Every structure is written in C-alpha cells, then in structure tokens.
XYZ file of C-alpha atoms in Angstrom:
393
model
C 26.126 110.530 135.652
C 24.753 108.823 132.562
C 28.222 107.442 131.735
C 28.527 105.820 135.154
C 24.939 104.583 134.847
C 25.206 103.071 131.325
C 28.620 101.327 131.450
C 31.780 100.828 133.578
C 32.372 98.390 136.426
C 29.458 96.769 138.255
C 30.730 97.447 141.779
C 29.593 100.849 143.049
C 32.105 100.870 145.935
C 35.040 101.345 143.538
C 33.620 104.765 142.552
C 31.183 105.510 145.413
C 33.756 107.817 146.987
C 34.317 109.466 143.615
C 30.538 109.552 143.131
C 28.859 112.718 144.392
C 25.961 114.966 143.428
C 28.140 118.071 142.964
C 25.405 120.114 141.290
C 22.261 122.139 141.866
C 19.634 123.558 139.531
C 19.438 127.253 138.684
C 16.224 129.254 138.329
C 15.304 129.226 134.603
C 18.501 129.327 132.523
C 22.242 129.979 132.620
C 23.322 129.777 128.942
C 40.507 107.779 117.882
C 39.954 110.757 115.581
C 39.808 110.338 111.807
C 39.126 113.333 109.520
C 38.249 112.413 105.949
C 41.277 112.796 103.570
C 39.913 114.456 100.408
C 42.247 114.746 97.429
C 43.239 118.318 96.487
C 46.068 117.880 93.948
C 44.063 115.744 91.505
C 41.006 118.016 91.223
C 41.130 120.452 88.283
C 39.415 123.804 88.857
C 36.688 124.804 86.342
C 37.260 127.751 84.034
C 34.227 129.580 85.459
C 35.453 129.314 89.061
C 38.960 130.502 88.052
C 37.737 134.057 87.318
C 37.087 134.735 91.016
C 40.517 133.595 92.228
C 42.246 135.478 89.400
C 40.419 138.760 90.198
C 41.010 138.535 93.982
C 44.782 138.954 93.520
C 44.322 142.266 91.721
C 41.952 143.388 94.477
C 44.720 142.779 97.041
C 46.938 145.678 95.798
C 44.969 148.719 94.613
C 42.257 148.747 97.286
C 44.853 148.232 100.044
C 46.922 151.188 98.777
C 44.067 153.634 99.473
C 43.980 152.510 103.117
C 47.752 152.901 103.301
C 47.353 156.515 102.157
C 45.286 157.081 105.311
C 47.936 155.303 107.387
C 50.778 156.884 105.300
C 52.863 153.699 104.995
C 55.074 155.061 102.226
C 58.156 153.592 100.557
C 61.497 153.385 102.335
C 65.038 152.107 102.076
C 64.369 149.080 104.308
C 61.791 147.675 106.708
C 61.914 149.495 110.044
C 59.471 150.189 112.862
C 60.489 153.793 113.638
C 59.217 155.081 110.254
C 56.898 152.046 109.664
C 58.489 151.443 106.269
C 56.659 148.975 104.014
C 58.261 149.060 100.551
C 57.303 145.622 99.128
C 54.044 146.811 97.487
C 54.301 145.160 94.070
C 52.508 142.538 91.944
C 52.787 138.871 92.874
C 54.275 137.989 89.449
C 57.797 138.963 90.561
C 57.812 136.169 93.168
C 58.373 132.497 92.395
C 55.523 130.099 91.653
C 56.262 127.986 94.742
C 55.995 131.094 96.936
C 52.529 131.724 95.453
C 51.271 128.345 96.776
C 50.956 129.635 100.352
C 49.027 132.651 98.971
C 47.051 130.508 96.487
C 44.182 129.493 98.832
C 44.376 131.538 102.065
C 40.600 132.145 102.102
C 39.614 130.047 99.070
C 40.494 126.886 101.021
C 37.716 127.723 103.491
C 35.280 128.365 100.626
C 36.411 125.100 99.018
C 35.568 123.424 102.324
C 32.198 125.216 102.198
C 31.522 123.348 98.904
C 33.730 120.221 99.271
C 33.848 119.344 102.984
C 30.335 120.759 103.477
C 28.131 119.322 100.715
C 26.311 122.556 99.875
C 26.279 124.945 96.908
C 24.086 128.052 96.771
C 21.874 128.333 93.670
C 22.310 132.077 93.294
C 22.168 132.248 89.486
C 22.814 130.012 86.493
C 25.732 130.301 84.098
C 25.571 133.452 81.981
C 23.119 154.141 93.743
C 23.267 155.543 97.298
C 20.638 153.658 99.332
C 19.870 154.851 102.833
C 20.913 152.651 105.789
C 17.904 150.644 107.057
C 17.404 150.566 110.817
C 18.666 147.173 112.045
C 19.993 148.131 115.507
C 16.524 149.035 116.834
C 15.557 145.388 117.366
C 17.150 143.421 120.193
C 19.869 140.936 119.250
C 18.509 137.412 118.719
C 20.016 134.111 119.856
C 19.575 132.494 116.409
C 21.993 135.052 114.983
C 24.426 133.807 117.627
C 23.857 130.328 116.183
C 24.745 131.626 112.691
C 27.910 133.382 113.904
C 28.978 130.504 116.160
C 28.357 127.756 113.590
C 30.173 129.551 110.772
C 33.019 130.610 113.073
C 33.156 127.001 114.286
C 33.602 125.866 110.682
C 36.271 128.518 110.020
C 38.032 127.698 113.295
C 37.711 123.950 112.677
C 39.431 124.227 109.292
C 42.036 126.735 110.535
C 42.600 124.837 113.791
C 43.212 121.550 112.020
C 45.472 123.438 109.582
C 47.633 124.659 112.464
C 47.327 121.134 113.918
C 49.063 119.738 110.841
C 51.602 122.561 111.182
C 52.319 121.454 114.771
C 52.611 117.810 113.707
C 54.847 118.737 110.761
C 57.309 120.812 112.791
C 57.638 117.985 115.355
C 55.982 119.058 118.593
C 57.949 121.650 120.538
C 56.386 124.569 122.367
C 52.601 124.752 121.876
C 51.233 128.108 123.141
C 48.535 128.679 120.502
C 46.379 125.734 121.666
C 43.159 127.205 123.137
C 39.575 125.803 123.374
C 36.778 127.011 121.082
C 34.082 128.741 123.163
C 36.452 130.149 125.828
C 38.753 131.981 123.409
C 40.425 135.267 124.340
C 38.729 138.669 124.354
C 40.224 139.539 120.959
C 38.609 136.487 119.346
C 35.263 137.238 121.007
C 35.401 140.834 119.702
C 37.002 140.350 116.263
C 34.343 138.063 114.769
C 31.674 140.625 115.705
C 33.753 143.686 114.737
C 35.022 142.536 111.314
C 31.525 142.677 109.769
C 31.593 146.488 109.614
C 34.939 146.834 107.811
C 34.400 144.374 104.936
C 30.686 145.091 104.317
C 31.364 148.285 102.339
C 33.790 146.397 100.088
C 31.510 143.312 100.011
C 28.189 145.187 99.814
C 27.689 143.579 96.399
C 26.026 140.139 96.385
C 25.914 139.870 100.195
C 26.214 136.751 102.327
C 22.831 134.969 102.590
C 22.739 131.754 104.651
C 20.203 130.850 107.358
C 20.381 127.726 109.533
C 19.404 127.642 113.219
C 16.716 127.600 115.937
C 16.843 127.476 119.748
C 15.040 128.265 123.019
C 15.524 127.860 126.801
C 12.650 126.193 128.741
C 11.365 122.670 129.845
C 11.969 119.217 128.130
C 15.703 118.540 127.732
C 16.093 122.289 127.515
C 13.825 123.524 124.745
C 16.949 122.625 122.696
C 20.329 123.751 124.110
C 19.787 125.483 127.521
C 18.705 124.619 131.142
C 18.644 120.904 131.977
C 16.390 120.353 135.140
C 13.310 118.718 133.483
C 15.674 116.859 131.152
C 17.071 114.607 133.873
C 13.664 113.141 134.846
C 13.536 111.394 131.445
C 16.548 109.293 132.423
C 14.920 108.475 135.782
C 11.809 107.124 134.069
C 13.875 105.135 131.547
C 16.261 103.634 134.117
C 13.264 102.733 136.310
C 11.818 100.819 133.359
C 15.081 98.860 133.239
C 14.502 97.709 136.862
C 10.897 96.644 136.152
C 11.976 93.436 134.382
C 14.388 92.509 137.183
C 11.757 92.835 139.912
C 9.237 90.917 137.791
C 11.664 88.128 136.841
C 13.081 87.563 140.322
C 9.577 87.362 141.825
C 21.519 91.388 135.164
C 23.288 92.397 138.382
C 24.746 95.579 136.806
C 21.402 97.374 136.674
C 20.677 96.630 140.351
C 23.810 98.300 141.664
C 23.707 101.272 139.294
C 20.008 102.112 139.724
C 19.057 100.766 143.170
C 22.501 101.297 144.810
C 24.163 104.296 143.029
C 21.307 106.685 142.101
C 19.459 106.695 145.455
C 21.585 109.393 147.202
C 21.574 111.515 144.009
C 17.781 111.713 143.718
C 17.357 111.894 147.495
C 19.700 114.892 147.633
C 17.780 116.444 144.729
C 14.470 116.405 146.601
C 15.978 117.914 149.756
C 18.004 120.804 148.345
C 15.242 121.687 145.804
C 12.099 121.200 147.910
C 10.788 124.686 147.064
C 11.347 123.989 143.356
C 8.939 121.041 143.427
C 6.235 122.119 145.869
C 5.950 125.735 144.676
C 4.417 127.107 141.440
C 5.929 129.382 138.739
C 3.882 132.395 139.816
C 4.017 131.698 143.575
C 7.433 130.860 145.063
C 8.596 130.936 148.690
C 9.574 128.296 139.403
C 8.356 126.207 136.435
C 6.423 123.539 138.359
C 3.378 123.151 136.092
C 4.419 119.914 134.352
C 7.247 119.236 136.846
C 4.675 118.218 139.479
C 3.069 115.626 137.170
C 5.751 113.094 136.270
C 7.316 113.205 139.740
C 3.900 112.181 141.049
C 3.946 109.415 138.444
C 7.286 108.332 139.937
C 5.845 108.443 143.478
C 2.749 106.452 142.504
C 5.041 103.986 140.771
C 7.067 103.768 143.988
C 3.847 102.839 145.778
C 3.410 100.121 143.155
C 7.054 99.033 143.595
C 6.541 98.565 147.361
C 3.842 95.954 146.931
C 1.880 94.453 149.809
C 3.878 91.226 149.447
C 7.249 91.249 151.170
C 9.481 89.282 148.745
C 13.103 90.519 149.040
C 12.263 93.504 151.218
C 16.038 94.040 151.252
C 18.295 95.445 153.957
C 18.686 98.804 152.162
C 16.647 101.105 154.397
C 17.603 104.279 152.401
C 16.311 102.530 149.286
C 12.877 101.988 150.881
C 11.782 104.346 153.654
C 13.948 107.493 153.742
C 13.471 108.246 150.051
C 9.717 107.848 150.549
C 9.729 110.268 153.500
C 11.575 113.027 151.635
C 9.435 112.248 148.567
C 6.320 112.974 150.605
C 8.071 116.126 151.805
C 8.690 117.015 148.127
C 4.987 116.658 147.261
C -0.976 122.208 141.677
C -4.315 120.404 141.729
C -5.519 117.682 139.368
C -9.308 117.867 140.036
C -5.969 119.567 135.214
C -3.080 117.960 133.361
C -2.810 114.188 132.992
C -5.274 112.358 135.238
C -2.833 109.612 136.265
C -2.477 111.391 139.632
C -6.149 110.759 140.466
C -5.768 107.163 139.259
C -2.746 106.724 141.510
C -4.360 108.549 144.437
C -7.228 106.037 144.400
C -5.424 102.855 143.212
C -2.623 102.130 145.671
C -4.396 104.083 148.427
C -7.438 101.808 148.200
C -5.357 98.642 147.736
C -2.908 99.301 150.589
C -5.784 100.351 152.843
C -8.124 97.494 151.859
C -5.487 94.987 152.922
C -5.605 96.590 156.387
C -9.408 96.579 156.587
C -9.162 92.949 155.490
C -6.898 92.199 158.499
C -7.852 94.636 161.305
C -9.653 91.681 162.911
C -6.791 89.307 162.023
C -3.630 91.487 162.220
C -0.952 88.888 163.145
C -3.618 86.252 163.977
C -4.298 85.619 160.284
C 0.637 85.880 157.876
C 2.882 87.959 160.130
C 5.264 89.424 157.505
C 3.102 91.324 155.003
C 1.641 93.419 157.838
C 5.097 94.621 158.946
C 6.185 95.381 155.372
C 2.929 97.263 154.799
C 3.493 99.088 158.106
C 6.914 100.540 157.339
C 5.889 101.042 153.691
C 2.800 103.149 154.525
C 2.574 104.367 158.137
C 5.735 106.557 158.414
C 5.493 107.780 154.790
C 1.847 108.862 154.901
C 2.430 111.073 157.964
C 4.811 113.254 155.952
C 2.317 113.150 153.062
C -0.521 114.679 155.069
C 1.929 117.078 156.716
C 2.759 118.468 153.268
C -0.936 118.670 152.372
C -2.097 120.143 155.690
C 0.622 122.799 155.942
C-alpha cells in the first residue's frame, strides 16, 4: 500500500484492478546486493588469539572419544554401516596442510565475523566445585530471549547461508534444494537451535556466553515495536492528508491527487465498514483497544468537515470521495467532556460555522448565491443524520 502510494505510475486505472484491500485487523496481536569484501589472507593472527585455535584441535579428539565409548563406535577394517565402523580417529597432523584449511575455521570464521564483520569485542579481562542447579524453568519464557536467539541465529545463518551461496556460485548453478527462507525453516532447524544449548553447556560451563541486546512489545503505535499494525496505519493517513492540504490550498502535482483522493478512498471506506465494532466499542466493552483509537479518527473526521468548506470550488464529480465516506464515517463514530480536547474544539467549530451559514440564509436561501447552499446541503444534511443515529442508538 505505501509502495503504491509513494511511487509508481500516476494513473490509478492501470493498477485499480490489481488494487484491493485484501486484509483485516486481528484482535490484539498475531506475532543490487553488495556484501563488503574484507581481506582474510593478508591479516596476521595475534599470538594471544592463536592459543584458542591451537587448543580447540586437541579438544576435538579426546572429549569425542568418551562419547564414542557410550555409542561404541570402535575400530574396524573399513567404513561400513552394518557395524557402524569409524576407524579414522587420529590426530590431524597426518593429513596434508591444504586439507587442514577446510577445518581451519569451521566455527572460528563465525567468531571472526563476530569481531570483524560485527564491530564488537567483549572486554572480559585484560592481558595476563559442584554448584547446585538454579531454578530457571519456573519463570515463563520471555520474548526478549527470542530476540537474542533469533538475532544470533540470524547472524550465524547469514554467514553460513552466504558461505553456501558462494559454494553454489562456485560449482556453477545446478540443482538447488538447500535454498530455504530464514524464519520458515524446517522443524529440525526450529528445534535444534533450542536443543543444542543443553549438550554443549556442560562442556562450555566455563566462562559462559554473556551478551544482551533486545527489547520488544505488542500494543498501539506502529506496534509497540514489532507486532500488531492497526494503529500504525493511521499515521500514514494523517501524513498523506497533509500532502493534499497544499494542493487544495494552491488550486483555490497530479500524482498526489490520484493516489490519495482516487486510490485510497475504497481502502479506508472498507476499513470503517468491516471494523465498525472496532472503532465504536471500548476495550472493556465490546459487542478492543479504542481508547486513543477514537481520538485521531475524530481528528480526521473534523478535518474532513474542514475539507468540505462552505464554498463550493471544485466540488468534483467523485461522489464516493465526498458523501459516502462521510456517511460510513458517521456510522464509525468514549467521551471527551478526557484525552486531547480537539474533539470539543471540532464539535463546536465546524458545527457552529456550517450552521451559522444556514441561520444567515434561512430568510434568503436561494434568494440571496444558489450554489453554496446545495454544497452545504449534501455536505451536512445526509451526513448528520447518520451522526445522530450513532449517538442516539
């Protein structure tokens, strides 16, 4: 919607058939490229950082052998599935140096990206028995912890996904089954990132990962950051209305007319009809989050009363632009006598002005000109009936 509204061809007819609402609001919530080439061959590792990578290789053998005793993956004549033979347990020194390159940075590349690609280093420390398990499962799982897991897994999957992307480009296309999106990954990916914390924590109980970055909620505004939209869309209505203010003032350029006053009218008019109970009701009483929702829509309605001035000007042939939207708007019409007081200002301002024209010309009517009375008639008289129907019911 915003992409059609902010750019693309002026004529609405060339996408009016494509254009449709195709959405409704839920109750409260339902939640060209150019990567930077960074040199890797030229950088020389420090001596201090080399101790970690050297010790990891020795951890690969001895600790893994104890697990294989549980699985009983003993030596054998050759690799075979019937006995699950696995005889290649040996140090890496027997292999060639070029073979060690693929095993050089399998995980250290991601940590290098944690320091190199991501410009962050933890200031843990400068250069130089059986605790009980605390109760962590008692508290309900928080959404911010989902932000930690999702952001870090996004970084790991971004680096690994681009790595397999260069593998696909290197091998020259071909069959491409492994391409999947990020959030909608398979059940194994959804379970493995959660389940692999338990296995490695006993080995990695020392030091412990300590990073914290995230905050979110699910309420009004855009969404209280990353959640239900609803309230969020009204911001664009107010902004795009302000774009039309200069056109109506100046005429009393053509792109804004067709997009706002010829493309968005059925969208908003459908919104008031299908979601009438959303607007008129309250959060507590429903026939849902209509405390501040009722305010700015009334600002829009009062502004519509200002837009339909007593002077005719280019009245315009677009009847849905003028009268039908006003009727359903009055249908989609808790107290202010509370919140911003622009509703009282509106309720007196255009009401008194639009009326006081009529009490000026009840003796004149047509006898005094005979165009502002008709414009005032269809502006006010059918719309106000629906207004008092909403109030009186």
